[PDB]
Amino acid sequence: AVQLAESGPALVAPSQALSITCTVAGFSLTAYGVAWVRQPPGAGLEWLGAIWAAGATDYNAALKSRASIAKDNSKSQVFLAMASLATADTAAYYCAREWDAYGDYWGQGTTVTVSA
Amino acid sequence: QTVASISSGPKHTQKVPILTANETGATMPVLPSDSIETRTTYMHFNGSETDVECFLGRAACVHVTEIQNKDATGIDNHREAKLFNDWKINLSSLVQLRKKLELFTYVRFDSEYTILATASQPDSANYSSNLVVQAMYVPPGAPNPKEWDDYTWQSASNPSVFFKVGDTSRFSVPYVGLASAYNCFYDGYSHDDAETQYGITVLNHMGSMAFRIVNEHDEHKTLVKIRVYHRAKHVEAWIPRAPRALPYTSIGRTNYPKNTEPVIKKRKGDIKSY
Amino acid sequence: GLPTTTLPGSGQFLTTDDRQSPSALPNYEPTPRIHIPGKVHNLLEIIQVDTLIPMNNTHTKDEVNSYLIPLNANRQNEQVFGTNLFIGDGVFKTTLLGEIVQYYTHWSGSLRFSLMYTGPALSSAKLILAYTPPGARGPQDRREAMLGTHVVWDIGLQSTIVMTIPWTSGVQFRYTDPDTYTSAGFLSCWYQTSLILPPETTGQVYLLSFISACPDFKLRLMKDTQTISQTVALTE
Amino acid sequence: GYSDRVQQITLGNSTITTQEAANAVVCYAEWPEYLPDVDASDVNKTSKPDTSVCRFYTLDSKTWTTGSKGWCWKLPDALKDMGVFGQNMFFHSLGRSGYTVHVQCNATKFHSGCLLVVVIPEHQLASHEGGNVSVKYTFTHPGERGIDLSSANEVGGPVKDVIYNMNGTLLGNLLIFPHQFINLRTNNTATIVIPYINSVPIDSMTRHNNVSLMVIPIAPLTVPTGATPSLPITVTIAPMCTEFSGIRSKSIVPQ
Amino acid sequence: INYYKDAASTSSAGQSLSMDPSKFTEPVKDLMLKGAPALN
Amino acid sequence: DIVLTQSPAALSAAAGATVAATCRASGNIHNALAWYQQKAGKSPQLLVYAAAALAAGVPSRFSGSGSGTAYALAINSLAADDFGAYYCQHFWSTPYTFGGGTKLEIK
Numbered sequence A: 001a002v003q004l005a006e007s008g009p010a011l012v013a014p015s016q017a018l019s020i021t022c023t024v025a026g027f028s029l030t031a032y033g034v035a036w037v038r039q040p041p042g043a044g045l046e047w048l049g050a051i052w053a054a055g056a057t058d059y060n061a062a063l064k065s066r067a068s069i070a071k072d073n074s075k076s077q078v079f080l081a082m083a084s085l086a087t088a089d090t091a092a093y094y095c096a097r098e099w100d101a102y103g104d105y106w107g108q109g110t111t112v113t114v115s116a
Numbered sequence B: 001q002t003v004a005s006i007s008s009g010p011k012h013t014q015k016v017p018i019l020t021a022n023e024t025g026a027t028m029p030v031l032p033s034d035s036i037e038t039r040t041t042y043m044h045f046n047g048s049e050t051d052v053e054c055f056l057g058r059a060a061c062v063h064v065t066e067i068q069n070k071d072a073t074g075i076d077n078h079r080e081a082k083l084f085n086d087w088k089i090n091l092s093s094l095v096q097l098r099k100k101l102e103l104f105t106y107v108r109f110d111s112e113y114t115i116l117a118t119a120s121q122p123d124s125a126n127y128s129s130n131l132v133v134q135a136m137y138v139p140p141g142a143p144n145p146k147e148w149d150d151y152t153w154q155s156a157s158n159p160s161v162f163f164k165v166g167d168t169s170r171f172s173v174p175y176v177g178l179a180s181a182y183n184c185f186y187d188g189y190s191h192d193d194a195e196t197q198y199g200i201t202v203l204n205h206m207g208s209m210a211f212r213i214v215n216e217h218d219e220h221k222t223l224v225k226i227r228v229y230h231r232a233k234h235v236e237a238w239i240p241r242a243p244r245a246l247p248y249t250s251i252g253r254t255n256y257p258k259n260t261e262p263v264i265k266k267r268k269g270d271i272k273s274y
Numbered sequence C: 001g002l003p004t005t006t007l008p009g010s011g012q013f014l015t016t017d018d019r020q021s022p023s024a025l026p027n028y029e030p031t032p033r034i035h036i037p038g039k040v041h042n043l044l045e046i047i048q049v050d051t052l053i054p055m056n057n058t059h060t061k062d063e064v065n066s067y068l069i070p071l072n073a074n075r076q077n078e079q080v081f082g083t084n085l086f087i088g089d090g091v092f093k094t095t096l097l098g099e100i101v102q103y104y105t106h107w108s109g110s111l112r113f114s115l116m117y118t119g120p121a122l123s124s125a126k127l128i129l130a131y132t133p134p135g136a137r138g139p140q141d142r143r144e145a146m147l148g149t150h151v152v153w154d155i156g157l158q159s160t161i162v163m164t165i166p167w168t169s170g171v172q173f174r175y176t177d178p179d180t181y182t183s184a185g186f187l188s189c190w191y192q193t194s195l196i197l198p199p200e201t202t203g204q205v206y207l208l209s210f211i212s213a214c215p216d217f218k219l220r221l222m223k224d225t226q227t228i229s230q231t232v233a234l235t236e
Numbered sequence D: 001g002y003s004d005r006v007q008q009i010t011l012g013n014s015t016i017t018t019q020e021a022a023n024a025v026v027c028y029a030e031w032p033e034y035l036p037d038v039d040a041s042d043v044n045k046t047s048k049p050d051t052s053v054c055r056f057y058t059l060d061s062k063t064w065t066t067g068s069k070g071w072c073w074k075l076p077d078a079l080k081d082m083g084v085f086g087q088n089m090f091f092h093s094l095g096r097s098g099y100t101v102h103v104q105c106n107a108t109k110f111h112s113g114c115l116l117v118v119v120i121p122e123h124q125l126a127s128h129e130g131g132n133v134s135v136k137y138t139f140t141h142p143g144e145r146g147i148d149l150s151s152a153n154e155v156g157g158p159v160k161d162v163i164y165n166m167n168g169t170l171l172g173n174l175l176i177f178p179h180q181f182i183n184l185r186t187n188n189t190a191t192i193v194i195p196y197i198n199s200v201p202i203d204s205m206t207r208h209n210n211v212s213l214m215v216i217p218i219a220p221l222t223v224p225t226g227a228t229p230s231l232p233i234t235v236t237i238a239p240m241c242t243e244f245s246g247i248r249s250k251s252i253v254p255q
Numbered sequence E: 001i002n003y004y005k006d007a008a009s010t011s012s013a014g015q016s017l018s019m020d021p022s023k024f025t026e027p028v029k030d031l032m033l034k035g036a037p038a039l040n
Numbered sequence F: 001d002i003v004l005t006q007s008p009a010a011l012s013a014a015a016g017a018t019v020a021a022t023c024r025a026s027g028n029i030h031n032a033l034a035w036y037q038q039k040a041g042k043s044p045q046l047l048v049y050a051a052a053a054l055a056a057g058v059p060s061r062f063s064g065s066g067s068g069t070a071y072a073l074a075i076n077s078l079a080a081d082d083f084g085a086y087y088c089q090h091f092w093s094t095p096y097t098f099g100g101g102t103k104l105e106i107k
Helices: B095-101 C096-101 D083-091 D171-176
Strands: A003-007 A020-025 A034-039 A046-051 A057-059 A067-072 A077-082 A091-099 A102-104 A110-114 B003-005 B060-069 B084-088 B104-118 B132-138 B160-164 B168-173 B208-213 B222-240 C068-071 C079-084 C104-108 C111-117 C124-132 C149-154 C160-165 C186-196 C205-213 C218-222 D007-011 D014-018 D062-064 D071-075 D092-104 D112-121 D179-183 D189-194 D211-222 D231-247 F004-007 F010-012 F019-025 F033-038 F045-049 F062-067 F070-075 F084-090 F102-105
Touching: A003 A091, A020 A091, A034 A067, A034 A077, A046 A067, A046 A077, A046 A091, A057 A067, A102 F045, B060 B084, B060 B095, B060 B208, B104 B132, B104 B160, B132 B168, B132 B222, B160 B168, B208 B222, C068 C079, C079 C205, C096 C104, C096 C205, C096 D171, C111 C124, C124 C160, C149 C160, C205 D112, C205 D211, D007 D092, D007 D189, D007 D231, D062 D211, D071 D092, D071 D231, D083 D092, D083 D231, D092 D112, D092 D211, D112 D171, D112 D189, D171 D211, D179 D189, D211 D231, F004 F084, F019 F033, F019 F084, F033 F062, F045 F062
Parallel strands: F010 F102
Antiparallel strands: A003 A020, A020 A077, A034 A046, A034 A091, A046 A057, A067 A077, A091 A102, A091 A110, B060 B222, B084 B208, B104 B168, B104 B222, B132 B160, B132 B208, C068 C205, C079 C186, C104 C218, C111 C160, C111 C205, C124 C149, C124 C186, D007 D014, D062 D231, D071 D211, D092 D189, D092 D231, D112 D179, D112 D211, F004 F019, F019 F070, F033 F045, F033 F084, F062 F070, F084 F102
């Protein structure tokens, strides 16, 4: 049972930080990387970034300054941290186990609303 | 006593046997002693069973046909009634010997045929009949049989073998190829023509066999199945080829069927999986 | 008349017996053998030739990408590929080694595994090819991979590493069919450092994996193969 | 001293230099030789038109355009319109020839991609229909243009699936045949020297193709960013130790 | 002991014991030493 | 970077029709493309990986095709489960940018 359960605060004031976690079950993070994809309501999917199976990270080119992905291999948790939020960051965020370097096993997703 | 592995110790050297270039089209004979520390072991092994005369030199079934002992009164042509049956000898109708032979482009061997005949009476027989089969070797240009008992079965110059059903025949045939080897593969035609057949050549033509029950007929029918088994011997093989991966569709052609199954097994996991 | 006794197995047709038989063509003079290049005397000659492995058998169709092992740029410590070493199965079932191996029941001796780097000449990579001998699992992190037999491969002017798989079977032969007692172990490649690409080059570069046999390779107990099959007899 | 990368092949009045070669393949370690008397059966005195036919003939260049499947040429069919070798092929009943096949594909150090340049004796092609369908004469005899394996199937033509080598085998197992790689990292050059390979000493050159040359992209062409996504491949073939026997009128083939 | 006058009638010759793989594994023109650089 | 231009924005169709969605990339992906299905208020589901290969548990109506820069997702005989928004994503190194999205509607 490969599961990637998102969890977030879901109500963040703007110009603050996100602490969105994916608890990993069914596999180890030392063997598979985790991609992050958001989707604002109405609009389409946006690839946020991927942490690879040994901690090397790649990001969206427009969000390299804001986003930072880290992980705990022992706790099976992947962290997404977006700094200096704007109102266009209101989106349901997703995790994915990597599968031939493609993203699947997408979690249910936690909606984040950045508003004051 | 051939050495399989030499004793090798720690090396720290500019001679690097395990780095090469596959671009050159060569396979470097890199030993285990070239990249790990080995001990001395011996082969105790000569490679006698992977020899090509051992590999191509056991008997494969090459053909299964049926002939019928039956009342022939009022039958038109006697070949559709299976009163006799002719087989153009080839080693590519049954695929287990075909895939072994088509590991090579050219092959030369004396043949060794074993013909087993087995009978069956599927309905209403009081006894099993003691039957004799004629297997007449018919080279191209010989008169083919049209009747089960015509003049062609006299066989004054064709080789024939008489044998009982239940018993078996056995005879060797020399290498009868016109060329210095048989062509397992022939990239060409018989002549420069827009419609002539591709790949079907007489360069692997081995003759033909005609089979009949020499007995007249009984009250019941007898269905005699003939099983020609071929053993190659004094085998010489040239130009090792890529092995067949797809199912064959016809004698003498490299055709494979449309919409065939993938021959490489798909892995359950990713490329990282075990 | 010589008094003889007839034994068991008389009139049997053992298909593998090698006896003398009468010739149907007496005084036949066959065609003179001319010199043809590439004469094969023994199948151990031609399984020392390396052929491509379809390591990337992750598609639902046979294609050229099945032979291509992808490398990626920003990857430390990860696994490039992994496979088990059942040479009559898996990625090896279709290779020339594995096709001839499946005509035999037993195999012994060392394998010859080659990787061929095909990226740009201004790219650099260090990889570590691990052989795990049996008893342990397939390695999971490059730390348990390099505890076994491994080669660290710096990729430079020579694009080919040749890693031997040394023989680990006190049971002196293994089965060519997959058998758990005679499992050969595991093969895996890992990023030693990483793949560095030059500027103005993006994407994946590919490895080509080759397999062949060392000259200590043994095959015996000849058997029919599971590759080819047949429903009805073929016609002209 | 002398490099294994810098080679020169002079045949006739033709010269090929390469500075980025691999080691040249001589097929089955046998250099092309004339037919000896002990193997001959044809009693005609053969004509050996040495420097006029045993010379490099450059074929038309193929563009390798990153979705290319491969190219197959037939020998002696690819050289049937090539000078005096093309004429002697049609005026003679018989002929045997070895070949130096030279394949050229240059690139920058920023390019990547790998070509399999393989020589297959008796590459009997499969039909795309299966069954007992043959390939017509004009499809196994394309001449200089060869067979483009990325082109569509045509009625009477061969199957063009590069994974099955056009014959029901597999692409990975072509390395049992004499081959080289043009890995653009390493070499821009494949040189294969082919002897005459046949079950007969001398043969009809128009109805029979002795060897085929396949140039197959294994690793696809990755060009650098903003570069032209295409590399020309040039094949240059020289006949070697070429005999012709049985001179008669010029044979008319299907075209 | 051969019971027949034909060479085709005789049994198998046995292992040729040649075992010469270099025409398939090293068909290259220049001899490449194991340990040397392949393309200097 | 590689921009995926997915076309068109919407395709209204009834059940049983043949619908093709197209992604054109700015660079060569070398068939490292994924197609995603996303229903209303659900997680995206991988349909086609490697631009032609169907994923695990995907019905055989879906068929990816194309190579180079142009890629097509064809559906033969649309069912009611096959409605929603479809997305490309390439996987050629990084960044793994998406296409715009094709929404399938009902006539």
